[PDB]
Symmetry: C3
């Protein structure tokens, strides 16, 4: 047990903290009248953890976007890389939109302005007038009686969408610079590494903060049965989203573009799928999916050796669907109804959050803060999903490993002629 | 025609967009009652263009000022470079002040707080207490009844003057660092190049945005005759400013400092002046003005080879006068009366905007946003000047080519002894 | 006298400006009814100096913290360096807390919200949700009647504590990067050098600004006797703090950790103490304290050669006590009572300000702006302490030279065995 617990010390501490917070909240529930100041003090370390995590989303957005869009090696990759990237973005967006549809349909949490103006505000926030203002303020439409007056007022909160847009453009241009801008790419690589070190430093404090957050959420909520039902229905929504996506949409895509049976493709990647369901890490399953594709499905080594390592981090269908579903679920437990602009923001920032989330287990929860602050939702509600994360995490990594495999198959099919010409010469 | 239109594709697209927007606005004028939401939708791509242009004025201010003030090579230039720089700044400021005088006199557009407090607020904004706040907020004096209470309140809007002051000081100090700070000069060179690439990317979208802006302005305004008269009088103001400046002030300066006939100097640069009136580009006329000065006017090759290439971009009298005139004209069509501090801000930011504006045709309109956001004016009114830009642009480049020529003559006269000593040894 | 005045030109100008401002304020006192606009104009150059100094506290905080925490050479120093650093921070914090205690006791200046919420707000500001917002805004608790509602509202003012925390973490992580991040360390070294050049540029303007500030403060205040008494009692508070600290706390520490007579240690450093009382510069006395320790007290050359040069700038007990005392004194003349969070902020930023303040004479006043803007106090009141700085400065540098000497003795005692082992091998 000493090697068992000491192997993944962070995981042991996080599980112990979650259990300790849950049991302490349950025990404190016995004192039915509770002082708001006392519950504030109990949840305060959770606030500290949330504040140190939200403190770093701006340097992470900047450095991550710049570093990723510069270190693409597009010319070296070729058209194979472009096909892989298009497939990655397409499937991630499909997964995010499917998740949004499923939450807005099932609405777990609801049991408990003009749309045109909302979309125009979305487009306005996508192009902020000022970067320093966009770091903490979003513009919005307000109509107040004086036929009716409408103007633009700055509401507080990070303008995540606008910053992401500007720094995607910035990274693209700086990559287009080429061998120049090497100094600035190195500067932002160093900045990103420093911020990741800070994020790990925070993650070591995470057990105590999560324990306090869960204790506060348990002691605060009125009816435990209502929240249990909401959590169960949220998990059902995520599971249905993953099943539909990774068992219908991806097979349908692979059949449309390749005219081949996707169920004959499934058997080839069954071992990779099981390993993902066990390892709960897309990166760990990577050698397994190489061997499975290369020997069972006969995919060429060039296309798999490119697609799989990149898709193990960039291409995460399940995490995207999970993040969209859970962001709308956090919105729905609070009673906050989301405008069209906020729904589109959830979709886009769920595509971005999936890309950022590394293949380490339980990173979607960390990247969730991107969506939560983009929409402006109470970030404290993450602990509820922390409670049941792991079971969804296994399914998520299974789905996105299946997505990687189908992408490898599709890109190989669309590049059979090119590889034939290369081998002939 | 295919080579005609395909040669300057951006110019073809911009002219086509301006004509299309004007004709579409004229056609939509037939539906006299028009919905504010519909006109908002029509002008929305114009808002997107304006927002992407205003989004980049802060990185342009920072990177441009730093790069320019570092890459001066003052020691290599000598006293000849200092004389050239002094002449450039002096004539640019004279042109800007003359333009301000002429607009405040003729007031095209008007047909349609204590001054001491205004100037003190100007000096306060020149030295901001905080850079991050100066990026989006200016301080101002407010007097409200309670002998009378006066305090300082932060009004929204970029503090362009304060940022320019701080980063001029920053660039000067970093240049004084010398061979050190090479890394930071390289960093800011890369940043400036990236932002210029983004500006070009935006400029390719410019035709659609300008078309929508002109359509919105045509459909919104009440009487077309009033706006036509205002535009005509604004063009008359710019033309009178250019005539007075480049036919009186510059010849008077050259006669005062050299005791020589400036009209004998004019004939030497007549070919350069005509080429500028045709090419509409100060950089393009540059070989012509070299040959004209060097052979007709006998100016030494050292002084001309230094003055002309630098003055082709730094020294723009006509663009400075144009930008001051047009900023006050935009203020005057809106009914906004300008305090003394705002007038001085217009003058200073018109000197800076002329320096920044590259010798490519129709760049003063892009640099105009510096002045418009420094004073806090509706940037959408740029399209009105876009309509009649080119005719003023030809005169502007003619005037500033004349300014370059007179600067070369003056600097040669003030450096006859130094060049004589150099040649003797 | 020409060499006398021309030797320290800045000091001559500052003393002349202080005397000129005092005499001009005294003369203007004869016109008892004075216009608020006229006194505003008189003190305006003081406002310009204060604004240019406050303008640079953010780049100084960032660059100084990053540069210092990277250029530590912890591995090369060894455990001797760690012991020296621990002693430095411990004694600086003790001095700051002693100063806070002494001002809150004697309260020079007073003659003229829940504490839990205050401390929670302190901890919240220590971890800001946004860096760009933390650059100019602090969060605070507000309770307004509707049992009672409490929420968080953003009050204006720099969040110095949060920025210091984040950039201490940033510098620590970037130092941990090692030979990587050399580019970013070089970038921030260049930035720090540039900002120091700007600070010197401002300091050359300091005489006029200080003269105008003292003139405004003399003409504004009602009773000169009251302010004279307050200044005298403030000086008495600083002197008592220095006496208690450097004659009880440091000797007591050295006796506790070494079991040796600290008064036998005092005689060894008497010459260094006198030189500090004369030179008014900790760096200048440095060779004197080397010779005194090395020959009178027999401290080993390794430990002294490490401790003394580092402690001449990092370790300033007297400046820390002075800065805490004077920040609370500035708060007390204005009638502003300080919450617990503001007192802790004064203590922490007084520890930081002492570290930053270079060993040049009269730098504590410049670093005082860190504390004054951290707490949000009128920075114009610095001139009152400027009037009587020098006499306190001599005592301050005497006390912190004594602190350096006691640190060298203590670190040598705690490292006798290590040096014995090194010499034996
Ligand atoms: C699930 C239902 C809603 C179907 C939706 C799926 C399609 C809309 C998307 C998903 C994957 C996309 C494919 C992913 C890969 C590519 C290669 C890519 O081809 C390129 O243009 C590469 C550049 C080049 O050819 O040089 C874009 C088309 C295509 C077939 C995409 C076509 C559109 C697809 C099939
Ligand atoms: C149009 C009416 C209002 C006359 C206004 C023009 C003058 C006020 C300005 C315009 C050009 C300026 C001249 C431009 C060039 C120089 C060289 C320069 O000399 C230097 O000090 C260079 C440094 C050195 O000598 O080492 C400054 C003076 C002078 C004659 C300037 C003197 C003032 C001038 C004539
Ligand atoms: C004035 C009154 C309130 C007494 C307060 C003084 C003590 C609380 C502080 C001041 C100096 C500190 C000492 C400064 C130096 C060190 C070495 C340092 O030892 C280390 O751990 C170095 C790391 C290592 O051993 O490798 C920390 C303990 C100690 C004795 C500190 C113990 C606590 C001290 C005595
Ligand atoms: N489960 C993901 C990691 C991120 C997440 O849990 O959302 C994977 O390894 O594929
Ligand atoms: N016409 C200017 C370019 C900038 C502007 O049009 O204002 C020139 O080439 O001299
Ligand atoms: N007197 C200090 C310098 C900083 C200050 O005066 O506070 C010293 O030289 O030790």
């Amino acid at each position: 047990l000493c090697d068992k617990l000491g192997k993944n010390l962070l995981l042991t501490l996080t599980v112990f903290g979650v259990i300790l917070g849950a049991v302490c909240g349950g025990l404190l529930r016995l004192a039915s009248p509770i002082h708001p100041d006392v519950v504030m003090l109990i949840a305060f370390p959770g606030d500290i953890l949330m504040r140190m995590l939200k403190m770093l989303i701006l340097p992470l957005i900047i450095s991550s976007l710049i570093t990723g869009l510069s270190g693409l090696d597009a010319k070296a990759s070729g058209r194979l890389g472009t096909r892989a990237m298009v497939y990655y973005m397409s499937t991630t967006i499909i997964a995010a939109v499917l998740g949004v549809i499923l939450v807005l349909a099932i609405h777990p949490g609801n049991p408990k302005v003009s749309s045109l103006d909302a979309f125009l505000d979305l487009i306005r926030n996508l192009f902020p007038e000022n970067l320093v203002q966009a770091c903490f303020q979003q513009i919005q439409t307000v109509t107040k009686k004086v036929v009716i007056k409408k103007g633009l007022e700055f509401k507080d909160g990070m303008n995540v969408l606008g910053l992401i847009g500007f720094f995607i453009a910035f990274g693209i241009a700086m990559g287009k610079m080429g061998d120049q801008a090497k100094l600035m790419v190195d500067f932002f690589n160093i900045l990103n590494e420093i911020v990741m070190k800070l994020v790990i430093m925070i993650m070591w404090y995470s057990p105590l903060g999560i324990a306090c957050l869960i204790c506060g959420k348990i002691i605060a909520i009125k009816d435990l049965e209502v929240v249990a039902r909401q959590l169960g229905m949220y998990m059902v929504t995520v599971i249905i989203g993953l099943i539909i996506h990774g068992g219908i949409f991806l097979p349908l895509i692979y059949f449309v573009v390749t005219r081949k049976n996707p169920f004959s493709f499934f058997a080839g990647i069954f071992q990779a799928w099981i390993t993902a369901l066990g390892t709960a890490s897309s990166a760990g399953t990577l050698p397994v999916t190489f061997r499975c594709l290369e020997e069972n499905l006969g995919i060429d080594k060039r296309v798999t050796r490119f697609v799989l390592p990149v898709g193990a981090t960039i291409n995460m269908d399940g995490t995207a669907l999970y993040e969209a579903v859970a962001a709308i679920f956090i919105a729905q437990m609070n009673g906050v109804v989301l405008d069209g602009g906020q729904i589109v923001t959830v979709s886009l920032t769920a595509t971005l959050a999936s890309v950022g989330a590394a293949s380490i287990p339980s990173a979607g929860l960390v990247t969730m803060l991107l969506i939560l602050t983009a929409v402006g939702l109470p970030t404290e509600d993450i602990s509820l999903l922390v409670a049941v994360d792991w079971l969804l995490d296994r399914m998520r990594t299974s789905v996105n490993v299946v997505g990687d495999s189908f992408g490898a198959g599709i890109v190989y099919h669309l590049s059979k002629s090119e590889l034939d010409t290369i081998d002939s010469q």
